[PDB]
Amino acid sequence: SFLPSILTPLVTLVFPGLCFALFFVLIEQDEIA
Amino acid sequence: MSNDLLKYLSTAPVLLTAWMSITAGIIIEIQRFFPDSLSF
Amino acid sequence: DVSGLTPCKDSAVFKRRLDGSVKKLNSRLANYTEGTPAYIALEQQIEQTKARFAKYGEKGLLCGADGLPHLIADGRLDHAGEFIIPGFGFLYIAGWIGWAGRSYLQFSKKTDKPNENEIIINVPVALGMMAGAFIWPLAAWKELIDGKLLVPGDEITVSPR
Amino acid sequence: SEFVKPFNNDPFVGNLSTPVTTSTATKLYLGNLPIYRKGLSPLMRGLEVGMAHGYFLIGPFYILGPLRNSPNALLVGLFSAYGLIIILTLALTIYGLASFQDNSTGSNLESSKGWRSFTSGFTVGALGGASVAYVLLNNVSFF
Amino acid sequence: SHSVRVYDTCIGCTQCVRACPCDVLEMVPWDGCKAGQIASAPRAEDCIGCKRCETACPTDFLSVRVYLGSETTRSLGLSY
Amino acid sequence: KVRVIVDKDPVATSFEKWAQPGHFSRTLAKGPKTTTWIWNLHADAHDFDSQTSSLEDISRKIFSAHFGQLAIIFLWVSQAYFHGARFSNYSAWLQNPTAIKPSAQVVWPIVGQEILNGDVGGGFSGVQITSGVFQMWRASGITNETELYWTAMGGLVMSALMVFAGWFHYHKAAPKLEWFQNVESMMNHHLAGLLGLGCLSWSGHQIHISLPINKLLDAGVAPQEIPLPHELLFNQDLMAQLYPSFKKGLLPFFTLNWSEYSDFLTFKGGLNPITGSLWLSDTAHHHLALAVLFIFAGHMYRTNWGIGHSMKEILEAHKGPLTGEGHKGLYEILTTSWHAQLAINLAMMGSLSIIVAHHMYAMPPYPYIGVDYPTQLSLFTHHMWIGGFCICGAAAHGAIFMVRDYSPVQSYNNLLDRVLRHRDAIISHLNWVCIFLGTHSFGFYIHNDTMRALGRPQDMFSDKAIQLQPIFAKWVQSLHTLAPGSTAPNALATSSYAFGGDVVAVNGKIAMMPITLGTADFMVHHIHAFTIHVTVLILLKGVLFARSSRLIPDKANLGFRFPCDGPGRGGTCQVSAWDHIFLGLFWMYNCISVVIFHFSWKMQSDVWGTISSSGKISHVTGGNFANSALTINGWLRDFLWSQASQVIQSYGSALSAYGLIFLGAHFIWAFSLMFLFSGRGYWQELIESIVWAHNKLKLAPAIQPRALSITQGRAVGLAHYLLGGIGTTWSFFLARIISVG
Amino acid sequence: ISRGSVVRIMRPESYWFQECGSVATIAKGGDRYPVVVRFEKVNYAGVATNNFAMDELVEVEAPPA
Amino acid sequence: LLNLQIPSPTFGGSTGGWLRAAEIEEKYAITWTSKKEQIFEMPTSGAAIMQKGENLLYLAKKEQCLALGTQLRTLFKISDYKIYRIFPNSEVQYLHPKDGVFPEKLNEGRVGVGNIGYSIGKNPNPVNVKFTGKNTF
């Protein structure tokens, strides 16, 4: 099928990259005032 | 020789070396005279 | 007979091993000429190999399917010489060594300079302790009965529990 | 004749005023690079940096890529450059988000608005530079 | 920052203060010891935790004791 | 004025301080209270600078210790010569060198170890040797065993003389610090007197005893009919029959008609076709020219007479704009501190040992040593290991100098001060170099492995997919091959056949062959560069940050070797220069191991082998290096797994000792990891439990047992690690090469 | 306990816990831990003496006569 | 508090100095007096010349300042060293000889901080202070 081509890059490159970006930004968020 | 040299020979490493050389000689000569003894 | 093993006297694999070792030496023997030191030394080697195999056969060792002696250590006196007799011999020798060490430590502590007595051995009395340790099983029993083998329990440091 | 002296006449700062660090050539080149040039807005700095990097990013992928010995070598190289530029500008945006959390000044690389403008310029410049390099390599027969 | 404590087994030897490389410790008057002084840690925030005080302490177990805790720039000893 | 001044009877000869073990150290002189005292005794045994404070006494101790070392070395040379004389087949090997395997050790028959007395040929049974001493003696001209016996006795006499000299120069007539600090006179005597006259005497020995005997042996005269050296020395008629120029005497020397000696003083180059080694006439000319060079060199420095240089002024005159005061103060540093001298000398000794390894394989100097493949591999690997060890000793003693003998008063603004003032820049740039070099060099291998596993050989960094050719190495090889015609007209052949030219072969085996360089050689050379750079990073950081660092401003106060400075600042573990040396020893071990593996595989695949009459060249492994050395999988399969067969299959044969040592070295290497990973606190608590068990039976010792110190645990782990690794490689190489070659 | 006597330590945290030691000095007045017990067995730091309280010591052998 | 115009030791510069954190979080200063101009070793790598009379030096760590003070005390016998912490606001806090004498000497004006009234091995167990914000000391 075409689901492997559609999903493997989506879930192994785009999603983990966005997760790393989100985690980095969140850990670098400073205290509220 | 003297009390000093006897004390030095009585020091720990010299005595260990002499005693273990004697033990190794005893084992080696026992092996020579009763070779290949797998059991009593 | 135990565990399906058989004596090494009637062991075809054991005999084959003996012949293989003999044939290997006799082959290596071809390089050297008669009467040389190497030739006579190899003749000693062959004689010792044959003597070892004959002695192993005569001693009653059990040979397995691989054609090598197998030692039975369970307590049967048919095979006492394998473990029981060497075991008691080692136990006696090891207790001799430990008793000589312990008795020398007991002496050396009473001395004015125990720290220097440990690294510079008083050999005249140390040899005495080595000799006197021959009767250690009776000496150990006597000291145990007299309460001098064990230090009581609350005289020995112990860490915070 | 000393040639290594304290940095800004400060012996206790962790630096030295060597010829490499402080010479007129170094000062001129660094101060005239876009990131340090005077009067350039953050958008202009980002734009210059973007085209400069996107022009050369295509080449490694084009020549040494898996499809180097393929009719679509240059197209694959350009797509690889575009993907790398996407990753780079995502890195820029998250860096701005993490560093310049609270800011209201603007017009400065060390502020949120200025860094956003710099990232925008970098993205546009890099895409344009990669496209221009693609066009040049297609028409390499000119040179 | 680390927590520096001094217990009443002190004997006023003033060697912990000498071993101290950050001026965390000082001698203050005391009644219990014959020397009339006891170590104290009024500047525990400057402590780094190398435990040279503990190394230099001659009591059977340490009259001066350092418990590592929250890390800071000073405690980590970062020049940057 | 340079003069001899000594103190008469400075020390009494007595055993009282033999009885007193820790007499030398102030702390250990009191006596033992824990087992750490025992370890500290050996650790501080030879630390004279810590033991005393007088440079005069330190120098006297060092001088007599050198005499003791010379005595040991003479005993070692005596063992070599005597075992050759008595327990060796040297006569049979001399009669037939190609067929007979050299052997000079015999094991007694005790526990069946007589199997190790393998068949080495010539009606002799023993352990095959790989030291090359047989070829050494053949070059020297020894043809009988009486000569070996008598030189062994002479070596024993020299060893006794060295022991006597060491006793005399400490207990009867010890020199002064003023005598010791005459560095100019020392350099003059060591250049002109030691090296110059040593080369001159060796050249004379060669010209008079080695050229005739070796030429007759190569012609075919058996050793029994060779004229004896005492006959050859003065019989000018026989020397003229052999080399016609000898009939002209020494007049062509005293007059400058030196060309008349062209027959026995040649510049042929290449290798002798008969023995497959360097020409001994070339060697004699070489040593004579070096004797002239060193005698000329040794008249440079000033002494009692006006003529001469002074190293103080030579150093002080060399200063530039980017260096401030320049080399001012280094003369004082190197005259006052023994550790600085030890550092420089160890660095040069180690690099020189590595150069010796690289030169001896490429230009086999001794006859029939090239075909003796075990000897070449053994000597190369041995000298590489010794070189690495010496270089790390150099780094360690440089660090010791920095900790102890450094002082800003003498080095204000000199090169040492200027280097310390930007150590951060130095180390950061070397760090970047290391990361870049390692990333690229090892990523070539990892990329190749990944592409091969993915079934994409066309994407590899191979000789036929993406070539990384060593253009500069190939260019240098081409220049060296063309040198004998253009740039070295008087040389008939190349310096080495590795660069190019013919394939030298003796009987079937190949002595030397051109070594071709390609992608695999590029990769492995850059791996070598990366390993050297990381080792230099570790050692140089240890030396530079010995005084202090951003983490510990007062690191010098703690000492040279100290465990740590506590868990503060996040942890200050292994901050010491000693610990930097401890870490760098692992890295030189890795470097030298990779170098010797590269040497072994490259030579078995591409040089060593046999050549047939038709010209077919068949190598040991079959030239698989060029295609299998591109991947770590190929390194693991075609070198380690493939060549471990001769080791693992050695049981029941003469190489069974090599198999046993292989397993034992693996065991010791594994054992070392216990010390390397574990920590002292666990072992101290375990020892507390065991001490309770002993106290229960009233036998706890007065010398309380303790876990080893942290520095000692690191040292023990490192020593066991190095011993296990070097022993594993030793057994593997020796078994493989003895079996196949 | 007394000068010249042998006393067994009872402080749980001491290296010489439940070991004998010779009393060398008893301080009067202040000195929360007035007894000064000297040992022949060095601790890990290396010191062979330490101060102890009255209740931390147990009398086992009176001084000589 | 501090003059900020004292002549500093003669030094040719080094890379061991403060790097972008002393000027934004906190710097340290140490001022002393020397009887003769003389060469000493910086806590950072290098050799400087302390001037005759007053001398002022900048550093990045209280540990570095204390190390230099110890060096001055046990080599040149200079015990007039005083150490300050300089904030980016230019506030100066005089730190090391706080009472005017070193910590080793006893003074009556010092109050005990972190002093416990029992032996070390009488602290409460962790189970006692479990689920509580206090600690066992």
Ligand code: CLA
């Ligand atoms: C934990 C179980 C598990 C695992 C390890 C995998 C593994 C795989 N799946 Mg997936 N898959 C699963 C369950 C799982 N699947 C389930 C239940 C479904 C729904 C029917 C699918 C539907 C599915 C499809 C349709 C396809 C794959 C494919 C793949 C492969 C590529 C990865 C990808 O992007 O797919 C992920 C795709 C999904 C739809 C995932 C759905 C969500 C799962 C259940 C999440 C599991 C989370 C786990 C329990 C906790 C994570 C903990 C964290 C700390 C890491 C890979 C072998 C592709 C393939 O065959 O390539 C050759 C493909 O085309 N999977």
Ligand code: CLA
């Ligand atoms: C570090 C070593 C190394 C090297 C040299 C290469 C090289 C290559 N790999 Mg890679 N590879 C490596 C490690 C390495 N690999 C490892 C460890 C793995 C395992 C994960 C792989 C796995 C792998 C795969 C699976 C594939 C490759 C492929 C490639 C090729 C193209 C990659 C690409 O698009 O790069 C893009 C690179 C860049 C965009 C930039 C590179 C850096 C620039 C040039 C540096 C310039 C610095 C400059 C001088 C600084 C100063 C400037 C100033 C003075 C102005 C190329 C031959 C592909 C191929 O087709 O191979 C033939 C491929 O399919 N590799």
Ligand code: CLA
């Ligand atoms: C010219 C050579 C030379 C000289 C004269 C010295 C001299 C010195 N070194 Mg050493 N050193 C050398 C080479 C040299 N080193 C090399 C090559 C290295 C690199 C590994 C080092 C690394 C080094 C360090 C890191 C240190 C020293 C230290 C010292 C000092 C004390 C050494 C001592 O007392 O050891 C006495 C002897 C021993 C303790 C025995 C050592 C045993 C070794 C580790 C194992 C031997 C294994 C054996 C060969 C094989 C076993 C086989 C097995 C099957 C049984 C002393 C000034 C120490 C110091 O404080 O310096 C001021 C110190 O910390 N050195």
Ligand code: CLA
């Ligand atoms: C295989 C084991 C191993 C590995 C991988 C490393 C790796 C490293 N050690 Mg070493 N080290 C080892 C064992 C190892 N060590 C052991 C056993 C010890 C104890 C003795 C040490 C002790 C030690 C010290 C004391 C030091 C090092 C240093 C280094 C670094 C050298 C610089 C370099 O080339 O970095 C580059 C990285 C590598 C060579 C690893 C493989 C790289 C591949 C090709 C990938 C690279 C491309 C890319 C970035 C990543 C891949 C893709 C990924 C995202 C999936 C590096 C990180 C030195 C250092 O830090 O120098 C700066 C240093 O000071 N090591």
Ligand SMILES: CC1=C(/C=C/C(C)=C/C=C/C(C)=C/C=C/C=C(C)/C=C/C=C(C)/C=C/C2=C(C)CCCC2(C)C)C(C)(C)CCC1
């Ligand atoms: C300094 C120096 C150097 C270096 C150099 C370099 C670094 C270079 C680079 C270069 C480069 C790297 C270049 C680049 C260029 C680029 C370009 C030329 C671009 C263009 C672009 C464009 C034109 C664009 C457009 C656009 C846009 C903007 C957007 C939208 C789209 C479009 C397309 C429209 C060397 C080493 C030699 C040495 C000497 C000195």
Ligand SMILES: CC1=C(C/C=C(\C)CCC[C@H](C)CCC[C@H](C)CCCC(C)C)C(=O)c2ccccc2C1=O
């Ligand atoms: C195993 C191990 C120990 C335990 C080792 C100890 C306590 C020392 C062992 C030395 C022995 C006693 C050497 C001699 C061994 C002989 C086989 C013993 C028989 C001879 C007696 C007469 C002494 C440590 O103490 C240690 C400390 C720090 C880091 C790692 C480690 C570590 O790995």
Ligand code: SF4
């Ligand atoms: S026991 Fe420790 S805290 Fe008390 S005086 Fe001694 S060193 Fe200072």
Ligand code: SF4
């Ligand atoms: S932990 Fe460090 S800084 Fe704190 S008192 Fe102890 S030695 Fe001083």
Ligand code: SF4
């Ligand atoms: S394990 Fe050793 S080196 Fe590491 S922090 Fe603890 S004491 Fe320091």
